[PDB]
Design a protein around this ligand. Sequence first.
Ligand SMILES: CCCCCCC(=O)OC[C@H](COP(=O)(O)O)OC(=O)CCCCCC
Length: 504
Amino acid sequence: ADTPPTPHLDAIERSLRDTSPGLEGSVWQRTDGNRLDAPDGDPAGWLLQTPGCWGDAGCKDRAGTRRLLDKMTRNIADARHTVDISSLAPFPNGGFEDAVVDGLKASVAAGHSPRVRILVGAAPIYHLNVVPSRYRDELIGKLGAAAGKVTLNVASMTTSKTSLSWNASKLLVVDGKTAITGGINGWKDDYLDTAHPVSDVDMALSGPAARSAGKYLDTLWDWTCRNASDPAKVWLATSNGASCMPSMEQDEAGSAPAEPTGDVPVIAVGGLGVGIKESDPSSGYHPDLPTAPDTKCTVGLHDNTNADRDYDTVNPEENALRSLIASARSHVEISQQDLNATCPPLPRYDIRTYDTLAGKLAAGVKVRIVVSDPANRGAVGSGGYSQIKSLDEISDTLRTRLVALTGDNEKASRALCGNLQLASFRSSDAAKWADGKPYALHHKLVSVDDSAFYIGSKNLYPAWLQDFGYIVESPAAAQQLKTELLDPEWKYSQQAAATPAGCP
Ligand SMILES: CCCCCCC(=O)OC[C@H](COP(=O)(O)O)OC(=O)CCCCCC
């Protein structure tokens, strides 16, 4: 009870408990006594950005990549009992795969027999080559004589075909004690073996919040083990005759409390997407849902982001992001692939998130939004690393939401023009990577007041997936985030700032 207050964490916790009280302890959880997992002589080494090659359009010194991969390997090498991987399909390949294999063999060479889960979400059409039994067989071959001691459960899953829901959480949890999470998929060709690497960020922690994340994953595997009765939803491959492990993380927690490793207070928050759980039946959540039609796109699907109270209650991650932004009293940095979705089949944007940002702009709070360059766009379903044709799609929508709010277009411009910084992502002085390709950005990052930040898998654009991430409140940690990532991103991305329509 010497601890500093957590104004931002307190406001997010309120929201989550109003929206989803019944999911506390499974799909969301606040904890004290976490540690941001950094090695010696590398104090911001808990922040796992890739490629981490600022100021060089040839990206020759990929210090972020190196650290990301050394930390995956080493977390796995330290396993006594359990390894729990979630990702977006394909299953991890190249160096992401080697981290897991080198890590498991090390654990076996230390004398352990680890249980391993690997879970991917699969979109109903690109799958993919995506095959659990082939992937498991590949790991078994790569694992050598170690395979005998490693218990694998390998699954690919789609929770709803019609509502476009599957796992996209990106988690590596070891012994319910350490967790690495964020936006990074195990896709070597996009992240590693390319001269135009995707820019992304994970974070690494240890502590009670690592257990919060395993609890989330047992939630996913309960559904997944049960729904292997339906091969249209789940493909599953186990090794060594082993049963499905719905309960791996509870089994490893057993009956003792998670011990603190540090002093960082953390909120873990995910969502159940569509087709796992209908609602939190214990929730009293009764919002006034938004109403503003979009002039560009009228979504055909039932709109779960903007017009479905039950979905909110099983997807606390949406409101956790909105209330993180709403808690900003001085400034917010948004670093995202996208704020707008591909409409149809999804709503183009989250009305409330956009309302939340327009409120901030009106109130004189500084809003910074950096997104992946529009030049990255496909290909309606590719899905390339942009879902807009120009940054005006974000500022025009801000304008539209500023007009709803205030009544006049001239007040709108003072708040938009005065308080918004909007740009495509760059990491050096050059407009694109040295090989000609544009920089692809895939962060799911929010920072508020250099005090509290989200790093996880949940995008700010509309998506109805199983996602997960962490919210940290710590001035020290957010100072490291500012210095190592956000300042540098603004340094180089300000070159590609948008002046909105209606501004000088
Ligand atoms: C025609 C566009 C409809 C896309 C379906 C729903 C979605 O939000 O997917 C976004 C998701 C987020 O991934 P990450 O966690 O940020 O890496 O991307 C995917 O799940 C794969 C896209 C496959 C297209 C589905 C037809």
